[PDB]
Amino acid sequence: IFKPEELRQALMPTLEALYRQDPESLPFRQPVDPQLLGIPDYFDIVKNPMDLSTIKRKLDTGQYQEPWQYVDDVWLMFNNAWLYNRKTSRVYKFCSKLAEVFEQEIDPVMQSL
Numbered sequence: 001i002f003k004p005e006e007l008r009q010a011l012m013p014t015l016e017a018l019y020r021q022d023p024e025s026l027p028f029r030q031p032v033d034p035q036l037l038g039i040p041d042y043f044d045i046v047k048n049p050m051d052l053s054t055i056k057r058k059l060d061t062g063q064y065q066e067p068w069q070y071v072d073d074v075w076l077m078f079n080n081a082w083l084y085n086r087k088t089s090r091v092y093k094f095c096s097k098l099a100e101v102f103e104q105e106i107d108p109v110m111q112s113l
């Protein structure tokens with residue numbers, strides 16, 4: 001069993017690392033509005049959207065019972081962005097960096113729990 005406070009205290013810095021990255025995290029900070037961007041095929045391809053603000057909300061309200069659940073959600077966010085965008089799109093490169101930074105911070109923390 002984990003309590004909501006310990007999970008937030010343990011994992012929030014890894015999420016903060018992602019938020020720290022400017023301008024990489026900016027498009028990930030809130031959920032996409034595909035009609036606004038003119039990419040109306042987005043929810044055809046990305047079946048389960050995920051963004052930093054949803055992950056932060058779940059960690060703040062303790063909707064994660066287990067730390068794997070917070071880790072699924074981060075990878076869901078990256079896998080969505082890699083699924084939808086071309087390898088040469090600016091969002092692709094951004095997702096690639098945040099993914100890069102997330103590995104450096106997550107591994108030590110998961111061993112700690």
Ligand SMILES: CCS(=O)(=O)Nc1cc(-c2cn(C)c3c(=O)[nH]ccc23)cc2c1ccn2C(C)(c1ccccn1)c1ccccn1
Nearest residue numbers: 027028030031032033034036037039080081084085090091
């Ligand atoms: C209501 C929030 S919003 O939808 O407007 N926020 C934005 C989100 C996203 C976005 C998020 N994800 C995960 C994707 C993705 O996978 N593919 C394409 C776009 C995006 C892009 C948004 C923006 C805003 C500008 N942008 C744009 C499209 C953008 C592109 C690249 C990097 C940053 N911003 C932009 C910037 C300047 C001028 C015109 N458009």
